[PDB]
Amino acid sequence: QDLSEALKEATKEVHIRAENSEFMRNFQKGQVSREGFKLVMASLYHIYTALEEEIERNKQNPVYAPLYFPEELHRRAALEQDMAFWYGPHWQEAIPYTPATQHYVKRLHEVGGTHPELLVAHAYTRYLGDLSGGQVLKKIAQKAMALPSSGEGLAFFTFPSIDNPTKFKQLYRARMNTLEMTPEVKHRVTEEAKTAFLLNIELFEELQALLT
Numbered sequence: 001q002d003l004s005e006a007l008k009e010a011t012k013e014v015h016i017r018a019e020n021s022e023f024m025r026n027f028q029k030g031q032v033s034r035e036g037f038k039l040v041m042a043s044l045y046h047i048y049t050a051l052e053e054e055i056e057r058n059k060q061n062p063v064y065a066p067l068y069f070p071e072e073l074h075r076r077a078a079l080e081q082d083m084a085f086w087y088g089p090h091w092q093e094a095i096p097y098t099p100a101t102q103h104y105v106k107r108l109h110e111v112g113g114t115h116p117e118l119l120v121a122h123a124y125t126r127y128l129g130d131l132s133g134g135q136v137l138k139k140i141a142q143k144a145m146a147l148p149s150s151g152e153g154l155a156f157f158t159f160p161s162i163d164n165p166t167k168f169k170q171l172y173r174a175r176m177n178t179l180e181m182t183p184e185v186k187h188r189v190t191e192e193a194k195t196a197f198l199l200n201i202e203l204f205e206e207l208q209a210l211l212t
Ligand code: HEM
Pocket: 004, 007, 008, 015, 018, 019, 020, 024, 025, 028, 124, 125, 126, 128, 129, 130, 132, 133, 134, 136, 137, 196, 197, 200, 201
């Protein structure tokens, strides 16, 4: 079976669970405000920073290299503009770094530093969603919080170097399908994508408790 199909299959149950964290459930109904949105975007700042640092470290390694698309996909620069927007010119000292965010960042460094053959699980979970439901969430955020069409405050959700998210996703899937793949790597990649979804779910439960 193709890696891209194995991953969709392996994560489709947990994706349902993630969709219905309270945080995502409120978000989707347009019950997201400045305070909750800044908590989640600052946490994403730390997460994509660690992920992209590990992508950089492993760019040349064949267990990852086919998925190396910094121009199209990387989010850290976009997150930095959003942080200056939401938190001001001194955002680096102001942004929170929560325990659930540290835990996710810690696993991303373990994977990148010691198990780079699993890094594709983590890029898949984040970037492919960002190119799917993330586009729907962007529209919801922008309406709930009165964010302008010009995109300030939502650079994270905008891919200026991808014309067509759907086509890019198909390309990225075909490329995932050309990684070296053995039963051993396939089994552990799909397991690591369930872990990445859980780390996301635990972040949302943590932020929701912070807010309430
Ligand atoms: C309520 C919040 C969410 C909404 C509304 C949403 C919505 C969607 C939608 C509509 C798709 C396309 C499904 C398809 O056409 O087959 C999708 C795909 C995807 N989503 Fe989400 N989702 C949410 C939460 C999450 C979370 C928390 C993550 C994990 C961090 C995630 C990761 C992904 C991934 C990796 C895919 C690609 C599936 C594939 O094509 O293999 N989503 N999402």
